Amino acid sequence: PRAPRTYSKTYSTPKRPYESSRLDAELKLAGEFGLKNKKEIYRISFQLSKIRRAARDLLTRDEKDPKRLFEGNALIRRLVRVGVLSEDKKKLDYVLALKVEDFLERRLQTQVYKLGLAKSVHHARVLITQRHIAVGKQIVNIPSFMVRLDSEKHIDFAPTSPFGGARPGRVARRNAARKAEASG
Amino acid sequence: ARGPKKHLKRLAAPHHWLLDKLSGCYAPRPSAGPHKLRESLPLIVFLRNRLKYALNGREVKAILMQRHVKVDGKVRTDTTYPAGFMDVITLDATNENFRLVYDVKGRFAVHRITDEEASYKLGKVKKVQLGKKGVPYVVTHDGRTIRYPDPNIKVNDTVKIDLASGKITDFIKFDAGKLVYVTGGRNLGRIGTIVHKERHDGGFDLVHIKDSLDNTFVTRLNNVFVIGEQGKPYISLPKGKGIKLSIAEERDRRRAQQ
RNA sequence: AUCCGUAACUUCGGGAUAAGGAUUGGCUCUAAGGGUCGGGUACGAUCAACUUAGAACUGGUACGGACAAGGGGAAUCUGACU
RNA sequence: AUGAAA
RNA sequence: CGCCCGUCGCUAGUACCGAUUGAAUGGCUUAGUGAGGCCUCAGGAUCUGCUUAGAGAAGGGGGCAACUCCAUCUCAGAGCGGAGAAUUUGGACAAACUUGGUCAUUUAGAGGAACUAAAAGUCGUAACAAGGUUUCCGUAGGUGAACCUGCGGAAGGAUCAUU
RNA sequence: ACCCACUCGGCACCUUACGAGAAAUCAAAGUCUUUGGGUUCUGGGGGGAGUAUGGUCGCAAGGCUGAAACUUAAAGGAAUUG
RNA sequence: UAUCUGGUUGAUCCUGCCAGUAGUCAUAUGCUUGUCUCAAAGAUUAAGCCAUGCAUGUCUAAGUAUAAGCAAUUUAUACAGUGAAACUGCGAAUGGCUCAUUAAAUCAGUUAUCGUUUAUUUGAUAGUUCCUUUACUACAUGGUAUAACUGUGGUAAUUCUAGAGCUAAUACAUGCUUAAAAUCUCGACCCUUUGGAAGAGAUGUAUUUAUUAGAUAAAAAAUCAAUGUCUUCGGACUCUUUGAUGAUUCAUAAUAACUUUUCGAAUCGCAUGGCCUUGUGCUGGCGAUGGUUCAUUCAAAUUUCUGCCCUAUCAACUUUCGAUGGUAGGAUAGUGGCCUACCAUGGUUUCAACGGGUAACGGGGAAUAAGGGUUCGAUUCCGGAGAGGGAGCCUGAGAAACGGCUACCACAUCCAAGGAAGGCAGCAGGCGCGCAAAUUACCCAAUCCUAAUUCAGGGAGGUAGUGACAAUAAAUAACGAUACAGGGCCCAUUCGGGUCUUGUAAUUGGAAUGAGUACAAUGUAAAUACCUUAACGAGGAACAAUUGGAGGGCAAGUCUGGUGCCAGCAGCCGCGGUAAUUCCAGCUCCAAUAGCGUAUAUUAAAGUUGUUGCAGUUAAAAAGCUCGUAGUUGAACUUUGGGCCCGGUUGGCCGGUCGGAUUUCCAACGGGGCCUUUCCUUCUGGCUAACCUUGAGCUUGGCGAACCAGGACUUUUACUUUGAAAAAAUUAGAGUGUUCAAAGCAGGCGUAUUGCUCGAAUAUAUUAGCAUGGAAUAAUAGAAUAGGACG
């Protein structure tokens, strides 16, 4: 009787499974951007495919089609707001062209690595999941973020964890107690 | 099912109350009254999901029972009474008077107004007849049944009422070139200044109607609601005045009012 | 006796009253079914028969009231039949 | 006239 | 020394025919019995209002002595009525049962005749070359088996050809 | 009756291959993925099976209609070299 | 994102199928499984049976309270506080569960009730109730129980009940009390006769019948049956009034009666207010309850058009004893074969009737896709049906009620054997069925509902538990330096450095928090969980990621041992008969990953269902041939043409705005109108319109649609355009930082004391139905021995 909660995925499996080209390309991407799951890769490709289908079946339409105008401008707006797209490419053909590599570089983990708080994208991953980070004034422990660039301006380490101070560390206190006992 | 209904689920409750599909799988059924089921606003959804003056139906029953509230100049101490179209409600607390009208987005608005704008209302005549003992009478769109009006007052006209009695302050007939208000369809909330009409004798009197941006449309003569004459409305009107701008125009509006 | 319904098989003719069921009195009525005589250069009068159908009322549910008056079905062997 | 199984 | 056909023989399976007036299940249903309520004809325990109803005789009021006025515990008796269950006639509604008929859905079965499958079974060698009687089609007959023969037809023939 | 030329309708023919087709081959077996002139009938892997049953026609022989279970990865068409 | 691959051959092209492949809110199962969030869940087989326990009861200020119940009135002598039980009134017909039934039936859209009921709410609404109407009768108000209770008690048992004594009412049965006029009758009386008359009964509401009115295209004349108004009795005669409806015998009003008699307050809580004719006189408020009629609202029942799966190994079906219609009547709340009496004999059918089957309730919708589509859809929302099968019925506004009665049928229980009580397809739970499916839990905190009512109740519902059904997020590990190997550049001083690389590592160190433990607070009805953070919690032996596979399609061993066409593997092909790249083990390696496989159904693939869009010479397939009905399809033609203008969109000068917007714009583009033999309905009207109407340059008077009511011819369709409307959820999609995300519809901003503030769009909605501009296309009758139009 309680109206059932909608659920819908955010990915789609490959049509044809075993294509060595596909597998090696997406492995390159996983091994450079520090990923664990072809699930994640398929997910991002599925989002890209959705927006690309929209792009196709929108540029099919004439100019000044108010549907085209509103939806394409909103699409531009969210793509510039997330930063996968630039601040000067709003012609919808760049949208036809955009890349999973663009999505991945706009993710948080490799962003962290570019900003230099990691020394390795995997170091960024473990820091994210161990909460040695916050993008605004609230901690986040998810790599897949799709930052909105205000976060980018506002990045810092976790205030409530070392590398932003406020505590020496669990094993830090452990080592300190160890040396206190040694001196004792 | 063997008798009258008593319950009401969500998702059979109408759209324009904006009741949420979560929060318990049952909804407030409007008990019978001077207005229909669907084009009616229960006081529970009013107080609990328009003002947030309360949070729960228990609180709302406390309010209705302590009688800060009154409709038609009467307390009306039921939690699910139909607050219909055009209707007046008066609150001693805050000394407010809310009016129940529509918005162009297809919703019951909340029109803050004064005590005299409450003390008069509007009512569409639903029909006219001759009661027993030769008493001509009429009946409105809010179940109000009134005796000895002007013979000039005929069907599809509108009346402005004292609200201390069911008597008339004045009336306005139906004819080409009069200001109206829409009730039914995609045009829920429009105000579109009758330009002409058409009969189709046998059913569905239709009316061609356009608002002051030249923008025209067509509506059913029982869904329209005449509010007086062109220019002056007999009441104060809500934000928009029944315009239905484009999605992009409204986007720009709010982006100007960021 | 009337009404209802009727298998397999068949030489298509039969089987078949198949099987199997219902009803049937008395009294008072009602309907239809005929013959002959009738018209200025649609119809009337008049006579007598049995049938069939139906309806009321009735009865110690009885009634082809005595007499009279088929038991049937599914299969085999055998000869075709009279 | 026939000519084993993979 | 290729491939290949059918009978016969063993093993396993699937379905079909089949005596058994076969068996079940369900539905529709003639006829018959027909509950149970409901409506209508009565019924009348029972209770109960009114109308009187005369007196066994108290009380007091009056001829104060018989006698007289009304109330009174009493009981018939009479009608004037109200409601009234059990029971009850007839009617329409009609569960269930019995019996047949009928419609579909599954199912047992002596035996019989088939089909299929299965590494190496027997008998032959019909077919593919002119396949050793050119093949096949229909029809009829014949025989262990493929199969043969007759009548007509075709080429998918072994001939596109006799001025 | 012949000859020439032409004509309409017929049995067919010689050559091409624009066109088509899987190929043989074909003046349609063409004007079909640049997919539509009109209509009818039939087929949907092979076998089981044109079997079983039920109707229906016939003296019969048999015909018309006509499945399923089950089994199987092939059978089959046209051409090439051997 | 309109995709293919392997397999018949010695090889080739093909048909043609198979298998592979991807997905499923499609199920089951296996092996495994650390975390956050959301959550389905005994439908499939049995609508099979069910123990046990709950699931609907209910009161205020205010219907009845002496509880011999409890506080205390002390403002109350009758109570007047509270208050079980009981009477009463409501409701128990909603919810919830399942999908057995049902194939023009439900249902979906779409119409009607001018053909009906409707408690409840909501708005209005009962001067008329003394019926020999004068004593026939209290209206500062009338009669009756009866419960509860007292007690006697009776059965083994029952929500079993009798017997006797009380008492109450908004329970029952009854019951008067307020106007004025106005017509009829009578009708005293005068009697008049032109004829005048006092006085008396009636009339409210409601039901039933009969009757009238309830309207109205146009103007005059002759009179009277008798002048009728008032009279000049020469006749002036006018005056007249009726709403809605598309349209009614409509609304509604009145005559005359009918009624076994309907309603017209004997009810209740508060507050006590005013006149004095100083009377418990007379008047007075805010309410609750109920109440006749009408309308309204939530409903309900019938109802118009359209539309449903497979079947002809079902072609005739229906009507005895209703099938089709009609008349009259009955019943119904209402029309009507709904039923009867009588009567005519019809009605449906290849445009597939009727019959059968359905692992059929239907729809909103789901998977899946370029389009077209195919399939599923019991299943959270809508409408239907049912309560073990059937039938019936009481109460009620509302049930054919089943958590209500009666019976029968099959089930099944307790018996102190006489009798008694039941129907989980409600929540839990159990048996059985199976491939296949949760706790005999907490709470009404919310969402809502119900009652007399804020206060109580609610397995409706929420909560938690089981839960790898499905979805979201995402740990299992990392980082510096130390032994090797590099790539640029510099020195080009050799092969020295290699500054720095980026890895290879029985290298080493740290910091680094999580899972789990939480003290706690927070969470929530109470919690248990999430988040928060103390304190405790790693170096891999730590805290240990599985599931499939390695010959191909199809990525991943020419590795080791074992086996020897055996055991076994393998979807398809195939491997294995002593060197197995397939088997069984070790090692390694690839795929996906807390999931992966397997079995079955279904979609894409599949142009292997082919309308789009299949094949038919030989691959399966053209009927032996012809005729022929229905069906589908069916030659060409009937208005073209040009002119004339008009004004809109698009650009196009000028940008006269510093890349916005304008003009004469040349031109195009489609649109409106006049004429070219082109009536392209007109009569009444008022607008008379556009007014020929003109007053001196802004005046007095043109031809009806351009507004409208009608009279009118309006021969038929299909088609096509536009609009109203199509319940939400869903779907697509706007905005939105649930810490991202799935989600949801919230949120955001303050001077953070007054507070401010956008939102919750929009789109889609098939056919069919209504209106709708058009008039090409397709047919479609038209006036021919003219019953022919204008007349």
Side-chain angles (χ1 to χ4, degrees), chain A residues 1-169 171-184, chain B:
Chain A
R2 220 202 75 167
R5 282 273 169 175
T6 63
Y7 62 83
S8 312
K9 290 143 72 202
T10 321
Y11 74 114
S12 67
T13 194
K15 189 183 283 291
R16 305 292 84 166
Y18 305 118
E19 281 73 12
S20 299
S21 78
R22 190 182 73 73
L23 295 180
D24 281 334
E26 65 196 10
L27 174 145
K28 263 174 184 213
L29 290 165
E32 82 188 3
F33 280 107
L35 299 172
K36 64 185 283 171
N37 267 19
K38 308 281 153 64
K39 194 169 271 288
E40 305 177 81
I41 288 156
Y42 304 154
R43 152 171 87 206
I44 298 286
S45 162
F46 183 41
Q47 298 155 25
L48 175 50
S49 291
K50 271 178 265 202
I51 61 182
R52 193 158 267 148
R53 292 150 67 265
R56 288 184 324 148
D57 291 323
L58 266 299
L59 193 64
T60 190
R61 292 283 82 95
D62 58 304
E63 300 255 348
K64 68 160 189 67
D65 181 2
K67 197 167 187 288
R68 163 162 175 185
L69 310 188
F70 198 104
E71 269 72 0
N73 290 320
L75 194 59
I76 285 154
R77 191 181 68 87
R78 75 196 73 192
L79 266 285
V80 305
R81 171 154 60 166
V82 71
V84 170
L85 193 141
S86 84
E87 312 318 323
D88 48 350
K89 270 85 81 183
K90 327 298 163 79
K91 320 310 205 201
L92 212 63
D93 47 15
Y94 310 101
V95 189
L96 304 172
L98 292 201
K99 268 62 58 182
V100 304
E101 287 84 355
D102 310 332
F103 286 100
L104 295 152
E105 58 83 13
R106 294 300 299 160
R107 293 176 74 228
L108 204 58
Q109 185 184 321
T110 191
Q111 268 280 311
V112 163
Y113 174 77
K114 303 340 191 189
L115 271 293
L117 291 72
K119 276 60 68 187
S120 85
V121 303
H122 303 76
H123 205 246
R125 181 62 149 283
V126 63
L127 261 72
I128 287 295
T129 197
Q130 289 185 308
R131 298 144 65 154
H132 313 309
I133 176 59
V135 302
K137 310 318 305 155
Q138 56 187 16
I139 302 104
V140 56
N141 52 17
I142 296 94
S144 80
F145 204 83
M146 296 296 98
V147 311
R148 280 78 59 182
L149 295 75
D150 57 342
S151 311
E152 279 196 342
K153 271 80 78 178
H154 296 61
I155 301 302
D156 51 353
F157 280 96
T160 311
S161 177
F163 317 125
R167 193 169 174 85
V171 79
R173 292 191 319 290
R174 202 179 265 189
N175 281 108
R178 259 77 188 154
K179 181 47 55 185
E181 300 142 12
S183 60
Chain B
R2 299 177 45 223
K5 287 303 317 306
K6 292 205 278 189
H7 274 255
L8 169 54
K9 275 147 180 186
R10 287 159 181 288
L11 309 155
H15 197 201
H16 59 265
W17 301 352
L18 320 186
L19 277 170
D20 68 330
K21 67 194 276 161
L22 74 154
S23 81
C25 68
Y26 280 120
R29 181 140 164 99
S31 69
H35 280 250
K36 307 278 185 64
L37 188 69
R38 309 287 267 172
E39 62 194 271
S40 170
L41 182 66
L43 320 186
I44 184 65
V45 56
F46 190 62
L47 279 82
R48 207 179 65 158
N49 290 325
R50 310 278 77 182
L51 323 183
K52 323 300 161 291
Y53 271 33
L55 291 84
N56 286 308
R58 182 182 62 82
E59 297 155 312
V60 188
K61 168 52 71 193
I63 293 293
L64 269 284
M65 196 55 42
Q66 70 190 29
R67 312 191 180 266
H68 273 259
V69 69
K70 55 181 283 187
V71 179
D72 278 332
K74 325 177 76 177
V75 178
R76 288 278 179 271
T77 176
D78 175 88
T79 194
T80 185
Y81 191 87
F85 175 64
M86 185 54 218
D87 288 310
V88 301
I89 178 66
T90 311
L91 260 52
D92 48 358
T94 76
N95 192 244
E96 275 175 323
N97 267 276
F98 297 91
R99 180 163 268 158
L100 281 296
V101 77
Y102 266 116
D103 65 348
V104 71
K105 293 291 109 179
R107 312 187 277 255
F108 265 97
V110 287
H111 201 58
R112 276 173 171 72
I113 56 166
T114 191
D115 306 326
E116 55 268 43
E117 197 166 4
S119 83
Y120 77 86
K121 72 195 269 182
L122 295 157
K124 186 195 210 195
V125 68
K126 278 286 180 73
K127 60 178 190 182
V128 310
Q129 278 190 36
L130 174 58
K132 287 278 159 38
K133 289 217 193 312
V135 186
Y137 75 112
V138 311
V139 299
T140 69
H141 91 272
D142 57 348
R144 260 161 183 285
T145 71
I146 308 300
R147 318 213 303 182
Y148 294 119
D150 199 305
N152 296 127
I153 279 166
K154 297 304 310 197
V155 186
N156 300 125
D157 303 337
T158 285
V159 190
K160 185 175 139 150
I161 288 156
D162 311 306
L163 276 293
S165 78
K167 299 185 280 284
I168 306 187
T169 70
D170 81 323
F171 76 100
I172 297 93
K173 287 189 72 53
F174 194 97
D175 56 333
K178 296 290 157 74
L179 189 64
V180 309
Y181 201 107
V182 180
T183 53
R186 281 153 304 292
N187 306 116
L188 199 64
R190 298 214 77 184
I191 302 195
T193 81
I194 294 155
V195 291
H196 83 277
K197 63 196 305 317
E198 45 188 9
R199 184 176 180 179
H200 310 108
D201 206 48
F204 274 36
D205 268 352
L206 266 171
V207 295
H208 296 249
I209 289 177
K210 68 97 179 174
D211 64 338
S212 315
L213 304 176
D214 193 19
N215 311 147
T216 194
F217 61 98
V218 168
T219 304
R220 287 177 210 176
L221 181 138
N222 297 324
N223 280 323
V224 303
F225 180 93
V226 63
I227 72 191
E229 63 93 25
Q230 307 290 27
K232 193 250 184 176
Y234 274 80
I235 71 192
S236 70
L237 314 178
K239 194 163 168 269
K241 324 296 157 289
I243 44 169
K244 190 170 170 286
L245 314 185
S246 80
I247 48 167
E249 202 77 43
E250 297 291 353
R251 182 168 56 89
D252 302 329
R253 266 213 196 180
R254 173 51 187 192
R255 289 164 59 75
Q257 199 257 332
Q258 66 273 19

